[PDB]
Amino acid sequence: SLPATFDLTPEDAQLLLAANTHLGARNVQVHQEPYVFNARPDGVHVINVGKTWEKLVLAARIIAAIPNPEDVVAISSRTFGQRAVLKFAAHTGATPIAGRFTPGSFTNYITRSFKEPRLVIVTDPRSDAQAIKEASYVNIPVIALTDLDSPSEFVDVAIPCNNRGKHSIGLIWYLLAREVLRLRGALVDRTQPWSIMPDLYFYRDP
Amino acid sequence: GWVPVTKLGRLVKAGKITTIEEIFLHSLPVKEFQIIDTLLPGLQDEVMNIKPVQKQTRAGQRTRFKAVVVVGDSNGHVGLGIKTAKEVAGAIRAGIIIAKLSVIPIRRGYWGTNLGQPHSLATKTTGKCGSVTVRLIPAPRGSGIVASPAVKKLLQLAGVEDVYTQSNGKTRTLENTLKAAFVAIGNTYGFLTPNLWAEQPLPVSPLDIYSDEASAQ
Amino acid sequence: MENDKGQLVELYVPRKCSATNRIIKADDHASVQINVAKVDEEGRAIPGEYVTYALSGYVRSRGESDDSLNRLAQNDGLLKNVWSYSR
Amino acid sequence: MRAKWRKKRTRRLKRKRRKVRARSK
Amino acid sequence: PKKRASNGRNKKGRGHVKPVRCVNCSKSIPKDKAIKRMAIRNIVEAAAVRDLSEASVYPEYALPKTYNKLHYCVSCAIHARIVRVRSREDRKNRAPP
Amino acid sequence: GKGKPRGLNSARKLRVHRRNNRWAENNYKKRLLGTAFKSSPFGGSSHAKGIVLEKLGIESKQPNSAIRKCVRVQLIKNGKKVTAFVPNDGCLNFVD
Amino acid sequence: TRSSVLADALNAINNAEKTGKRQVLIRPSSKVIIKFLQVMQKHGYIGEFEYIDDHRSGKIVVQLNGRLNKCGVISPRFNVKIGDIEKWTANLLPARQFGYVILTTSAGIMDHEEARRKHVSGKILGFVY
Amino acid sequence: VLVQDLLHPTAASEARKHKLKTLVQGPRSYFLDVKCPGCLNITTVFSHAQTAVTCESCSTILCTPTGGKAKLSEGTSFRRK
Amino acid sequence: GRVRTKTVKRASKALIERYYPKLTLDFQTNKRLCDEIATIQSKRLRNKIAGYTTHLMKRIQKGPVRGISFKLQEEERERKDQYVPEVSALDLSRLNVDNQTSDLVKSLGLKLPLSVINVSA
RNA sequence: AGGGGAUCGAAGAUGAUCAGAUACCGUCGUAGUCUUAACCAUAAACUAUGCCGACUAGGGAUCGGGUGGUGUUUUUUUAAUGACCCACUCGGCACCUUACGAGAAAUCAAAGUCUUUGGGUUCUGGGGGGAGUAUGGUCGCAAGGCUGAAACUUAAAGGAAUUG
Ligand SMILES: [Mg+2]
Ligand SMILES: [Mg+2]
Ligand SMILES: [Mg+2]
Ligand SMILES: [Mg+2]
Ligand SMILES: [Mg+2]
Ligand SMILES: [Mg+2]
Ligand SMILES: [Mg+2]
Ligand SMILES: [Mg+2]
């Protein structure tokens, strides 16, 4: 189906290993076992990064299939993903919601933050649980940046990645944006790396 | 007049969606009763109960009136609406809106041979709300709606000609009984039968086809 | 279904969940339809051309959609070595 | 009237009914 | 109706545990249902320590402590504000502090 | 198996259980005991005849307040005394 | 103790089907179970099933196509005449057009329509739709 | 998981399972040839013996029964099968 | 005793929203400019609104005030948001990897400059 | 019926309190509390949840047994064994989350796999009282237990939850 130049190139694996996206939780929940390439001594479970790359590319194909990019919605209440979702918003259509989700954003058509998206990407199914719950009320597919412990309820596409490291969250959102742009007339040639680096997606103190 | 605030109402107003069956097929949530008014103009309503409910207070009992409303064309659609309000007229109007917003399809079928148009249900169905269980059984032609007046009126508004009804529980709780019946008729399109086993190409929703004139900027 | 002399009489023929083959009801608002853009040479989206799946609200409410979607996408060639039959 | 005390009172009436009957017997 | 899954006690697998006597009123209490507290007090005070350090041989000798496990009936624990009646959701919380 | 036996050969148990438990019904108990013939003013019949012994003024139960104008009757076929209401405005004058 | 291996098998299939499983294990796999599964298979209510041979009573893995609404046992196996098959179908089957009542006859284990056209009758095993 | 090969489970999963609860139940026990300190006569010892198994030369002990696998007598060598 | 009602707080909020450049830190000119940019039916209410506007401008001079967004602060919001380091933090500083991760990359069949290390148990 | 009879303590005494107090509170105190040999056979004898069997979801802790780590630890420095750690497994007392599903709800992994109603089997209930009364029988030294109505009377009694 894929040609594939879409295999995990060793420079992309280089970024994923450098962002510690493979360092998973110590308690894998039963729907997240397929994404586990063995534990480590001292308990950390390694995520199979190639499966992260395949799920990410599938997620970007789902995003690219959405006709209007502005009704792709990306959610991150966690600060570690707030800049990443905003940058994903700036580079794609990607109507962003960073911070509080304001219960009633998908229902309650009279709220000022009322959106009617075609797809929702969340940084954390635990922290953005209200948005996932509201998605299940109005037929919205959900992609989520999931660790091995995060729940998979009403999550259709799970990208297996570290949910704790800001580099991991910033990289996955940056890679998702890069792949989405590659799969349309915005990053015309797939071989050469993107001009902007994964760092501007990372949260910064204070 | 009416200016849509949702994508579905915007498409229905523009005429890109012309039947409510597309809304059923793609499970699109309905949040504006003007969509139902546009797509099903021949929709008749009926108030089935107005009973008061009271709330004890520091000073006496505050009374509101709860209206149960059933809408439906006699050709395969009904809606149920429950609304309590200060005034009976207000509860009735808002019940009519809620009833229209909840409009569901029903699967009508043949009791025996498929001669003519469907006249009954295609399957035995049950619904439950509170203690009340309402069971609908397909009935032969000319049987009529063998049901109590309230359930009979809901089925008449649905378009069923012949049906058998069995009830259990405190059926005098009218709102529970009507809800149980509304569930049972809603289950008609949930029940999988061998003539629905055939695979289908899984169409594309008009929310995607007409995404251009939806989501107005 | 269809009457004596043809004439399909169904208000509509509902969609079926691409995972469990359950009928997706009109009120199943937790059910989703997922479009995956088909990709030509050198990685392009081909708008309006999707591989489509439908997931029942039950599967999503059971936390099974991600695994089910892995299996269907792999069976359709979208994924390569994500889902495994034996476990 | 507590149930166990009504039981106790009924045992007293029964205990004396079975004595007047034995007496009248 | 039923108030608690652990009816009011901690007994699932016994039938009979043993009685204990309330320290406040001598009421007989199944030992698992009794409200138990551990009073660890200074043998003197929180304020006469300096006096006893000044006016005693054996500089800072031991400061011994007094240990006693108190058993309370439900009534005496509530009336002494040891357990402090709680809301429906908050009574399910078993944490001490 | 939700209680009751289900064996193909448990007909005796089921019929005896039903026999035992029909005694919990009011009508079945009364009919099989023959209480209408035995313990009832009318010996199981729909109507009876009697002689007016005396006119009574029965004070109605609360919250009502009225004199209900009944008669004590001694039944011809039994000799039992019954109280019968005399229904209408007046009509106690007709009874004597 | 285990009293009906067929009741246990059909319960396992029902509870698997209701939760959405594509497969189910069955133990211990009588031949009546096998014939019952074959009647469900020939009408499309299950898929392909496998008999695992342990040396005691075997097991079965059944593949499920998602089209089974309910398979059940009727215990006790009531004696059924020709003329009271239709009352069992009326009591058990959702509609007159689809669904099958499974019988065991000296002509074999079969559905009620094959029983009608062979003009044979017997005991009732169960139903499927 | 909702779709899995019940006929071909992983060997790791089967090894993890109870002996009665694998696809076809079987024993996790084995038999051993044991060579005693004294002589080189072959005696076959069950893994979960329950007998204080002795030989001809060292006619005292080779294994001590336990609640599970027997323990060899600290001076023997053994080979499975 | 001097808590401001939402009518004052909302009016001052909106005034800062759409008139921040025109406003100052001085109440005298702030009330003189409330006269022309807003229609207030009372001199006392206008004084309160301009006083709370001046108070929020004083707060704005030291860090942003939550809920209040004007052009002069949002432009420097994206100015700070577009910060890009001179060298990556995910580029190689000399790739420390342990045993299971090394098995991961070799199962993937990718050749990368790894460096296997041992972790104390 | 013997023995024992420290303690506490139906009865009783007595001091209080109060309108009264033959109750709560105080001090005594027989029976009893303990034991032996016989009785009795009842408790909110409760998980108010019969037993046997199968299946349906996730998790961690814990008790007993087992299996496996070139895993720690003391004893000669480490062998082993013990104890502990980790990972599994069978059995058990339970717990937590969720609500598939159930329920009137409270709530419930059984109280689920029920009008899509059937795995086997035992017991019990059929509005509230009268009444666990009367009568007969039977057991018991007795207290009492088991079995157990009716005449009559009545529009409610009751369950769970909501607002006050
Ligand atoms: Mg209470
Ligand atoms: Mg007990
Ligand atoms: Mg029975
Ligand atoms: Mg009893
Ligand atoms: Mg009981
Ligand atoms: Mg235990
Ligand atoms: Mg009755
Ligand atoms: Mg009764």
CATH code assigned at C25: 3.30.1230.20
Asked whether strand J has any atom less than 7 Å from the CB of F45, the reply is no
- What is the SS3 assignment for D1-25? CCHHHHHHHHHHHHHHHHHHHHHCC
The DSSP result for C4-38, as a single string, is TTEEE--S----B-TTT--B--TT-TT-EEEEEE-
Residue spans of beta strands (DSSP E) within A83-202: 95-98, 119-122, 142-146, 157-160
How buried is G14 (Cβ within 10 angstroms: 0-12 exposed, 13-18 middle, 19+ buried)?
middle
Decide the pairing of beta strands A72-76 and A95-98. parallel
Q: Check CB contact under 8 Å for C22 and G66.
A: yes
d(CA H20, CA A163) in angstroms, rounded, equals 40
Nearest of G118, G112, G109 to residue G100 by alpha carbon: G112
Phi, psi of G18 (to 5 degrees): -65, -30
d(CA I53, CA I43) in angstroms, rounded, equals 15
| Nearest listed ligand to the Cα of residue F24 | 7
Q: Which two tokens stand for residue I113?
A: 């400059």
d(CA B103, CA B189) in angstroms, rounded, equals 13
Best interface-test mutation with B: which of A62, A66, A68 has the largest number of B CBs within 10 A?
A68
d(CA A168, CA A178) in angstroms, rounded, equals 15
d(CA B120, CA B107) in angstroms, rounded, equals 9
| H or E element at residue A169 | helix A166-182
d(CA H7, CA H25) in angstroms, rounded, equals 14
Q: What Å resolution does this PDB entry report?
A: 2.2
| Bridge partners for A97 per DSSP | A75
Residue carrying structure tokens 């029942």? C56
Q: In degrees to the nearest 10, what's the CA dihedral of G117, G121, G127, H4?
A: -80
Q: How far is B193 from chain G (nearest CA, A)?
A: 7
SS3 F44: coil
Region of residue F44 (left: phi > 0; alpha: psi -120 to 50; beta: else): left
Residue spans of beta strands (DSSP E) within chain H: 31-35, 43-46, 63-64, 71-72, 77-80
Which sign, positive or negative, has the C-alpha torsion G31, G33, G34, G38?
positive
What residues make up the domain containing C18? 1-87
Best interface-test mutation with A: which of I66, I92, I110, I112 has the largest number of A CBs within 10 A?
I110
Nearest of B192, B206, B209, B213 to residue B26 by alpha carbon: B206
Question: In chain A, whose CA is at the least distance from the CA of I92?
Answer: A18
SS3 A158: strand
d(CA E45, CA A48) in angstroms, rounded, equals 62
Residue A2 lies in a domain: no
Amino acid at B162: D
Looking at chain B, how many residues does it have? 217
What is the number of domains present in chain C? 1
Nearest of B2, B9, B64 to residue B214 by alpha carbon: B9
| Bridge partners for G51 per DSSP | G60
3-state helix, strand, coil in chain H (%, to 5): 10, 20, 70
Residue A199 sits at the chain I interface (C-beta within 8 Å): yes
A 10 A CB-CB count for C23 gives 21
- Interface residues from chain B to G (CB-CB < 8 Å): 109-112, 122-124, 138, 191-195, 197
SS3 A63: helix
- How far away, in angstroms, is E73 Cα from ligand 5 center? 27
Residue carrying structure tokens 């949040």? B31
- What is the SS3 assignment for A82-94? HHHHHHHHHHCCC
The DSSP result for G61-120, as a single string, is EEE--S--S-EEE-SS--B--GGGHHHHHHHH-S-SSS-EEEEEETTEEEEHHHHHHHT-
d(CA A13, CA A51) in angstroms, rounded, equals 11
How buried is D15 (Cβ within 10 angstroms: 0-12 exposed, 13-18 middle, 19+ buried)?
exposed
Residue spans of beta strands (DSSP E) within chain F: 50-56, 70-75, 81-85
What residues contact E48, with CB distance under 8 A and at least 6 apart?
none
d(CA B121, CA B102) in angstroms, rounded, equals 20
The DSSP result for B120-154, as a single string, is EESS-EEEEETTEEEEEEE--TT--EES-HHHHHH
Contact partners for chain D, using 3 or more CB pairs closer than 8 A, are: none
d(CA B143, CA G127) in angstroms, rounded, equals 27
Q: In degrees to the nearest 10, what's the CA dihedral of B133, B137, B143, B146?
A: 0
Q: Check CB contact under 8 Å for I92 and A18.
A: yes
Decide the pairing of beta strands H77-80 and H31-35. antiparallel
User: Residues of C with CB below 8 A from G65's CB?
Assistant: 21
Tell me how the structure was determined.
cryo-EM
Residue A5 lies in a domain: no
Q: Find the CB nearest G20 among H2, H6, H7.
A: H2
Which sign, positive or negative, has the C-alpha torsion I116, I118, I119, I121?
positive
Nearest of C56, C72, C64 to residue C14 by alpha carbon: C56
d(CA B123, CA B193) in angstroms, rounded, equals 8
Instruction: Please give the domain boundaries of chain H with CATH numbers for all domains.
Output: 1-81 (2.20.25.100)
d(CA G119, CA A122) in angstroms, rounded, equals 63
Decide the pairing of beta strands A157-160 and F81-85. unpaired
- Does residue I113 have a cis bond before it (omega within 30 degrees)? no
SS3 H66: coil
Nucleotides of chain J in contact with protein CB (under 7 A) are 47-48, 50-60, 65-68, 71, 81, 88-90, 93-97, 100-101, 103-108, 111-127, 131-135, 143-144, 150-152, 154-155, 159-161, 163-164
d(CA G50, CA G61) in angstroms, rounded, equals 5
Q: Which two tokens stand for residue D25?
A: 């017997």
Residue A107 lies in a domain: yes
For helices I43-60 and I6-19, angle between their N-to-C axes, nearest 10 degrees: 60
Q: How far is CA B20 from CA A107, B99, B184, C12, in A?
A: 21, 15, 20, 10
Phi, psi of G93 (to 5 degrees): -95, 140
Q: Which two tokens stand for residue E80?
A: 């002494």
- How far away, in angstroms, is G33 Cα from ligand 3 center? 29
d(CA B189, CA A91) in angstroms, rounded, equals 43
Residue spans of beta strands (DSSP E) within chain E: 19-21, 28-30, 35-42, 65-72
Q: Could you tell me the CATH number of the domain that includes residue A143?
A: 3.40.50.10490
| Bridge partners for F85 per DSSP | F70
Nearest of G96, G108, I50, G75 to residue B138 by alpha carbon: G96
Contact partners for chain G, using 3 or more CB pairs closer than 8 A, are: B, C, F, H
Please say whether the beta carbons of A161 and A53 come within 8 A. no
Query: Exposure string (b/e) for F13-52, b if CB count within 10 Å is 16 or more?
Result: eeeeeeeeeeeeeeeeeeeeeeeeeeeeeeeeeeebebee
Decide the pairing of beta strands H31-35 and H43-46. antiparallel
What residues make up the domain containing A44? 10-200
Nearest of B22, B29, B37, B39 to residue B6 by alpha carbon: B29
Instruction: Please give the domain boundaries of chain G with CATH numbers for all domains.
Output: 1-68 (3.30.1370.30), 69-129 (3.30.1490.10)
CA angle, residues I20, I25, I31, in degrees to nearest 5 = 80
Please say whether the beta carbons of B170 and B133 come within 8 A. no
How buried is A149 (Cβ within 10 angstroms: 0-12 exposed, 13-18 middle, 19+ buried)?
middle
Q: Which two tokens stand for residue A61?
A: 């194909």
SS3 A174: helix
Q: Which residues surround ligand 2, an ion (CB under 5 A)?
A: E 15
Instruction: Please give the domain boundaries of chain B with CATH numbers for all domains.
Output: 1-105 (3.30.160.20), 106-199 (3.30.230.10)
Residue carrying structure tokens 């011809």? F76
Looking at chain G, how many residues does it have? 129
Residue G95 sits at the chain C interface (C-beta within 8 Å): no
HSE-CB for B108 with a 13 A CA cutoff: 26
A 10 A CB-CB count for B115 gives 11
SS3 F96: coil
Q: Check CB contact under 8 Å for C86 and H8.
A: yes
Asked whether strand J has any atom less than 7 Å from the CB of G19, the reply is yes
Please say whether the beta carbons of I114 and I97 come within 8 A. yes
Which sign, positive or negative, has the C-alpha torsion A167, A169, A174, A175?
positive
Please say whether the beta carbons of H60 and H47 come within 8 A. no
SS3 G13: helix
Nearest of I11, I3, I56 to residue I37 by alpha carbon: I11
| H or E element at residue E60 | none
Please say whether the beta carbons of B34 and B14 come within 8 A. no
Please say whether the beta carbons of A161 and A145 come within 8 A. yes
- What is the SS3 assignment for I22-89? CCCCCHHHHHHHHHHHCCCCCHHHHHHHHHHHHHHHHHHCCCCCCCCCCHHHHHHHHHHHCCCCCCCC
Residue B125 (CA) to nucleotide J157 (C1'), in angstroms, measures: 37
Question: In chain C, whose CA is at the least distance from the CA of A185?
Answer: C44
What residues contact C14, with CB distance under 8 A and at least 6 apart?
B24, B25, B189, B196, C23, C24, C25, C26
HSE-CB for I115 with a 13 A CA cutoff: 6
Query: Exposure string (b/e) for I55-70, b if CB count within 10 Å is 16 or more?
Result: ebbeebeeeebeebeb
Task: State the DSSP code for A23.
Answer: B
How buried is G80 (Cβ within 10 angstroms: 0-12 exposed, 13-18 middle, 19+ buried)?
buried
